[PDB]
Amino acid sequence: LPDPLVGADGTRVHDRATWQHRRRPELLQLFAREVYGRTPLGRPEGMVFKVTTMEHAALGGAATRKEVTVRFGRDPNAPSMQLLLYVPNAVIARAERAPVFLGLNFYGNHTVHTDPAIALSARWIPAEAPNGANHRATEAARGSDAQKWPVEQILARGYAVATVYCGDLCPDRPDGLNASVASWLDAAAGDQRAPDAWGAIGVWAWGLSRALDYLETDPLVDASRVAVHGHARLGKAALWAGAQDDRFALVISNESGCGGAALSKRIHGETVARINTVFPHWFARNFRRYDDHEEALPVDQHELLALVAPRPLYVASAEDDDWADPRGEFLAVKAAEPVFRLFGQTGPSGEDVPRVNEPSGGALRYHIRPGPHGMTAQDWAFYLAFADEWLK
Ligand SMILES: O=C(OCc1ccccc1)[C@H]1O[C@H](O)[C@H](O)[C@@H](O)[C@@H]1O
Ligand SMILES: O=C(O)[C@H]1O[C@H](O)[C@H](O)[C@@H](O)[C@@H]1O
Ligand SMILES: [Cl-]
Ligand SMILES: [Mg+2]
């Protein structure tokens, strides 16, 4: 592995200021140029927030539900995304602003809960979407992804729940960038995009920061206590959003795998060539230089993990998710751990993967659970306990 504490010019990093002001920028530029693609703008001038629905007694009175259209320019044809937010009414009643879990969803806001008041998504949805007809949402799709989205449990634990359909931002399909935030800004289609131009993971990540922009204006939530989380490909997005945007208070990667938390140079499970051929829209075209050539990579994913430091970072695996390379995810955490310890934070104790269902580490935390790829109640219990400790 490239040593996170040795700079690209061979300079060894021995102090927190050099990490922050020299090594971090260096790593951000390398991930942007060679891996994810460059994010071509931050907050758009002229972005508009419009609350389209609000219900103070949603979920049997447990929560206030808002839907917010976030439009990225004043042009009414500019792209937008639809933010679903649930705020726990008990917290509101104590005249307190709730901390927030924020993450993208795979198949639409209407899939995170059966709640029939959620607007069905009008956007293209992938064929794998349960109860989807002709790539469009259907009433039968309501709550179809609830397993990954314990909304009422999260609310009962004192957190707001914010989500956006990843396909509002970039449709998850090999040509999706052609109708996305990226094509709003860049008339190039397909593989005419610049080699260092962002792909779907960068667009998804950017959307998470725009959601945080909205949350900073919502009087019901505390935008300085946002945990950004994602599962699998959306966990890749959560990692890159949290690395680019240090406003996020805590980052959670649930089984994000190749190009997320897993070491690429391990060549275990999904490889760089495989991921770029199946998902040519996810990464920068420059990342294809490393197809069957991971040895030339100037970074590996322990350095993306390290870009969260010293903020709390939870990486987790599933024992039978070999395609994600669970031990490669653990070793990325261990290889990032020296940067966290530079800031006085600690990672997993000892040098090999902990027993299943036994989290290990302080602000840099890891667990592996039994079972197949997924996001389970046990995963969520561990994440909520982590947030309880780190979000005041
Ligand atoms: O398997 C897929 O593409 C395979 C492929 C086909 C033609 C050219 C290149 C690759 C897509 O399947 C779903 O649409 C997923 O949401 C999306 O991420 C995947 O790329
Ligand atoms: O998003 C998911 O569930 C996963 O889908 C595929 O398995 C892909 O190869 C993984 O990289 C991704 O993380
Ligand atoms: Cl619980
Ligand atoms: Mg792998």
Author numbering: 36 to 427
What do the authors of the reporting publication say about this deposited model?
Glucuronyl esterases (GEs)4 are enzymes able to cleave ester linkages connecting lignin to glucuronoxylan in the plant cell wall. GEs belong to the α/β-hydrolase superfamily and possess a catalytic triad common with serine-type hydrolases. OtCE15A is an interesting member of CE15 and the α/β-hydrolase superfamily in that it features acidic residues at both the canonical and noncanonical positions (Glu-290 and Asp-356). Here, we have investigated by mutagenesis the residues involved in catalysis and carbohydrate binding in the enzyme OtCE15A and, furthermore, present a series of structures of OtCE15A with different ligands, including monosaccharides and, for the first time in CE15, di- and oligosaccharides.
To investigate the substrate binding in OtCE15A, we sought to obtain complex structures of the catalytically impaired S267A enzyme variant with GlcA and the model substrate BnzGlcA, respectively. However, we were able to obtain a structure with GlcA bound in both active sites (for this particular complex, a crystal form with two molecules in the asymmetric units was used) and an additional BnzGlcA molecule near one of the active sites. The substrate molecule is located along the edge of the active site cleft, making only one hydrogen bond between its C3 hydroxyl and the carboxylate of Asp-207. Although making minimal interactions with the protein, its close proximity to the active site makes this interaction interesting, as it could indicate a mechanism for substrate recognition and a route into the active-site cleft. Attempts to trap the model substrate benzyl glucuronoate (BnzGlcA) in the active site were unsuccessful, although a structure was determined with BnzGlcA found in a site on the edge of the active site cleft that may indicate the route of the substrate prior to hydrolysis. In both OtCE15A and MZ0003, having the arginine in the active state likely aids in driving the forward cleavage reaction too efficiently to allow trapping of the Michalis complex even in the absence of the catalytic serine. The structures determined with BnzGlcA, found in a site close to the active site, and xylobiose, with the sugar found in a secondary site ∼25 Å from the active site, could indicate sites on the enzyme for interactions with longer glucuronoxylooligosaccharides.
